[PDB]
Structures are given as C-alpha cells and as structure tokens.
C-alpha cells in the first residue's frame, strides 16, 4: 500500500477527486489517499501539504482557482518536466482519430521568469532563459520516459535555425543524450513543421520534447486534437522523486456541486500516476474500464457529452473494472 497526496482543489475538484478514489477502491488499487488543502498562505504552501508531498512523493491534484498556487508547487518541488499523453478516445469522436502523442515540456525556464524591461518608452524586451542543465535534464527525462513507456521515438522540437544560441543549445543537449540511448530513435523537427504536421497527420508523432513556450502551445494543440482539456491527463515530474499529476481543465464553478462533472482527465492523470510508480496492471485495468465506458456511450456526462451524472459515469467504471 502506497500513500498518495491528494489535493482536491476547487470547484468540481472534490467531486471528481471522490470519483477517482471510488474507482481506485473498486479496482483494489494499493493506494491510500492523504487529502491536503494547499491554498497559499503568508508566499508559501501550507506546512501540512509540503510535508506529505516530500514524504509521499506522489501527488494527484484537482483544478485550482487562480502568485499562482501552481507556480508555488513548481518552485517548491522543482517540477521541471511537464508530461502530457494525448491519445484519441474511441467513442469521443473528434476529426483526429489516430493521435497517440506524448508531449514533454521543459517546465522551469524560458519566458516564465516574468523577466521584462521597459527599454525606452514604448519599447519592451521580454527575456527568455535557456540553460545547459535544464535542457540536458529534460532530454534525459524524455528518453527515460520513452524507455519505461515502450515509446519508440523522441522528437526534439525547436527553431535552432532562427535562435541559433538558445534553441541550438537545447538541441545540442537532446542530441548528446540521444547518443547515449540509441535504444530510442531520435529526430528533430522545426516548430513550424511540427505545427503543420500536427494538423495534417498527428499520427506520425510519438514523444515530443520541447522548451517551455513551445510545449505550452503544442501540448494544448494536442489536447485540442483529441477533445480538449477535459479528457487530457497531465503530469509534473520534479526533483527528489516527487511527481504531481493533475487536471488541467478549469474548476468549472458554474456546475460545481451538481453531480455533473467529468472525472476523465483526473482519472487518466491518476492512471498516469500508477504507471509512474510501477503499478501497470492496475493502470491497465482502470484505463480499460474508463475507455470501455466512453465507447459504450450510455453513461457519458454532459461535456463528453451524454445525459448522465458524474455518479453514473463513475459507477459504470467501477462496474467494469471489477471484472478483469
């Protein structure tokens, strides 16, 4: 039995968090949940949340309200890798049906400094940061992710023809790491070509590694291909073995307490969490049960969009996962 820090979050967070905890129970997942609130105080995160996470190493986070509370978590646990698997969902048709992509985004540097200067009146310079160490670290992560998740191919996304020094450096570290892992097939592609190919045939991509700003945009483009943030899982991997898995959809205040919310994103984030800690057999069962439920379509919640309550959708997943 493994303890996982659970941050319900705001709005529908408690509701969809309940659904995931129920489903994990039905699946007999060896997981027990340490619920923590993280609303920022003083600027810091509560003692009681910070201790659990340092000890438990695994965290599951619902949606938060809007210094950002996500920003504090990133600084606090040094969450340097943002990971987003994007897979088309049978039964939730979008015009892109063979998407199976993992975006991996350097999450500490780039223009998220907030560093910006008025040079003279009417002229602003924003400052983007790239470092050798972070680029090496995110590339090592993308190759390790490839190996542990049976991915064949890592593509580095860059504009190293335009930004020779900053993207060239990021590219140079990916290549250096690729020489040590010929296990995985490595190639590199210009941002603009990636965007084109993303809409023309996303089925060609496997694992995409990229600096912070590109990843922020392409990870949302990929989520758009498969149906939006409501069905996208997401992980943040940090230092000291901590990893926080999260909903990236909004809190949805309009529907907060009405048994209407869609727990798929969080659930698949939890499935992502199981895989990160080696519990593949449970991840497989829980994921199958959820996909089988969406494919059936009888119990879809309103945004997926059936005529069903979170409860019924959650109950169906529990039903199906008890049969293995």
């Amino acid at each position: 039995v493994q303890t996982v820090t659970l941050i319900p979050g705001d709005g529908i967070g408690p509701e969809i968090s309940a659904a995931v905890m129920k489903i994990f129970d039905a699946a007999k997942a060896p997981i027990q949940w340490e619920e923590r609130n993280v609303t920022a105080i003083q600027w810091m995160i509560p003692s009681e949340a910070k201790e659990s996470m340092d000890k438990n190493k695994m965290g599951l986070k619902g949606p938060l309200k809007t210094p950002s509370m996500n920003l504090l978590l990133r600084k606090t646990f040094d969450l340097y890798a943002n990971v987003r698997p994007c897979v088309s969902i049978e039964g939730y048709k979008t015009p892109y049906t063979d998407v199976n992509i993992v975006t991996i985004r350097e999450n500490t540097e780039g223009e998220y400094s907030g560093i910006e200067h008025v040079i003279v009146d009417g002229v602003v310079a924003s400052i983007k940061l790239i470092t050798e160490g972070a680029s090496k670290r995110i590339a090592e992560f993308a190759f390790e992710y490839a190996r542990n998740n049976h991915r064949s191919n890592v593509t580095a996304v860059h504009k190293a023809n335009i930004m020779r020094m900053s993207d060239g450096l990021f590219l140079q570290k990916c290549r250096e790491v690729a020489e040590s892992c010929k296990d995985i097939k490595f190639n590199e592609m210009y941002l603009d070509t990636v965007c084109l190919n993303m809409v023309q045939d996303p089925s060609q991509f496997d694992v995409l590694v990229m600096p912070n700003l590109y990843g922020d945009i392409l990870s949302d483009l990929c989520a758009g291909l498969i149906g939006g943030l409501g069905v996208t899982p997401s992980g943040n991997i940090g230092a000291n073995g901590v990893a926080i898995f999260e909903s990236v959809h909004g809190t949805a205040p309009d529907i907060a307490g009405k048994d209407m919310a869609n727990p798929t994103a969080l659930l698949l984030s939890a499935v992502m969490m199981l895989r990160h800690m080696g519990l593949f057999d449970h991840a497989a069962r829980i994921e199958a049960a959820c996909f089988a439920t969406i494919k059936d379509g009888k119990s879809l919640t309103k945004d997926l969009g059936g005529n069903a309550k979170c409860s019924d959708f959650t109950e169906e997943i529990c039903r199906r996962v008890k049969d293995l």
Binding site: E116, V124, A125, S126, L129, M198, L218
Partner: protein
Amino acid sequence: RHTVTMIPGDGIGPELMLHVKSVFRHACVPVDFEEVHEDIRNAIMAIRRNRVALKGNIEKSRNNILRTSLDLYANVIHCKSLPGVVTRHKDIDILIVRENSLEHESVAGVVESLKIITKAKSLRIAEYAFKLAQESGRKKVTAVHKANIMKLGDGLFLQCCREVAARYPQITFENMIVDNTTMQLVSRPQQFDVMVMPNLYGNIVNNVCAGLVGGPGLVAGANYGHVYAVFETATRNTGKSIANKNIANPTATLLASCMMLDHLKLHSYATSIRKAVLASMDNENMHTPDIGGQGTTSEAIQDVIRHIRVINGRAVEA
C-alpha cells in the same frame, strides 16, 4: 496596363511563374511582368520601380533584405477552405496579419534571448488589421497573444490593439491567448475572421491554418508596406526536391496572383481566375501530390485555363 515586378526565385519558383504568365496571357490581364533576380542592391533598385511584385520563394538574408528595403511591415496570409479539397474542417476563411535575433551567453551554459515589442509597430499592425477588416467587409479582429505570461510585452501589444479597436467600434474586437487559439483552431476554426499577432505566434498559427485548409500549397500571402506590396505563397519552402518534375502545386501561386490583381483593382480578372482555380480544384484529378493527388501542374494549369471564360479580351463570369 500595370507593370509588376516578377521575382522568379529558386526551386519551383520559376516554373510556377511561367504558369502564372500563361494564365494571365490567356485571361488577357493588362499586366506586364518585368523579371528581376552589390548585385542584389541593384536588383532592389529595379524592384523599387514598381509598387507591386509577385515573387517565388528563395534560399544577411535575401528575403529579409527584401522586406527591409521595401519597408514591408505587414505579413498577411489568407487561409480559405477550397471545397474540392476536403480536409477535416470546412468553411474556414481567415486573414492572418502579423508584423514582419537577440541572444547572448551570460555565464557558461546560460543563454538569454530578448523579444522586442514596440508600441509603434504594434499600433501599425493593429491599424493594418482593422483597416483590412473594414475594407473587406470582415466583422471581427482577434488579437492573439500570451499576455498572461508576458505581461509587459504582449500586454503592450494587446493595449495597442485596444486603442485601434476603439476607432473601429463596428468591428468586433476579440483577444485570445495563443494556447486557447490553437485549441480553438483544431476544433472550431470557423469562429475566426481576422487575426493579428506578434511575429512568433504567427509562425505557429500560419502553419496550423495552412494545414487546416489542406496544406501550404493552397495558401496565398502578401507583404505590404505603405507604398510597396509583394505577393507570394504562404510558406517559404522552394520545393527543390520537387523541381522541374511537373509536380508542384500551382494553387497558392495562382491565388497569390489573384490577390495581387485585387490590389491593383483588377477585380474582374482576379475573380475570374480565382473562381477558375477553385472550380478546377473540384476535380480530384487536378490535385497535385502534396495535397494527396496524382495530377501534374501542367494538367492543373490547363484545366484552370479551360475554366476561365474570356470574351473580347476580358475575363467574365462562367
């Protein structure tokens, strides 16, 4: 009779310009092309004689020296669905406007890059997008930005779009974070009309849209200054592998030459040619390899000419 500079360019550039001339000659378009190719500064002097150029693609950088010397500050691409090319999305019609590097190593291993936003250029591009939206009867301009993360710089750009929007109260003004934009583009791209954005996002958004309507071979662009305009294809690839093989897609070049015609106020010719290329593109046998067909550019041009009705020296409605 207008005189228009023609830059053949590299790769597929020259063979497409011959096809453009052929179509124009058949359409009896009153335009004469003067071809143009330090020598390049002398080439620019020649280009500067005429206020309009049509150019194929090329390649401190020639294409950027071009836009400097002609002071072409606005890049515009026109992403429009062609009904005969069926993609995943239909009825898209988008004008993407954007303004046409500073790095150092602080300490070993640490690189810093500077992105410049200026009030003066933001206002100029925003005015361009709003004038454009008005001139062409478009109802909406959407500013695309990342002001949530880059508060001063994209904030300044957004603020300049707001000042200009205030002088065009009859145009809806929308502003949208670049991430949400790319999400909206691959799910409901019909909501968009005129988009204006700083340079970096235009790379992403241009190629998303081009892909949404079927590929860059279908998409015309232009660069505009206060006096000069240069008309080109949206993407700058020269097609060097696919050159002299009678395989390049003529659509974007023909459509660029139509938006050059409208700029010269030769509307009846532009409409006639443009409807001819759209009607030709209803026949899948005229599609070239890059959009998934098996046709040759020769067959496609021949079909475009067959769809241009010319009566007494002038192009007419079919």
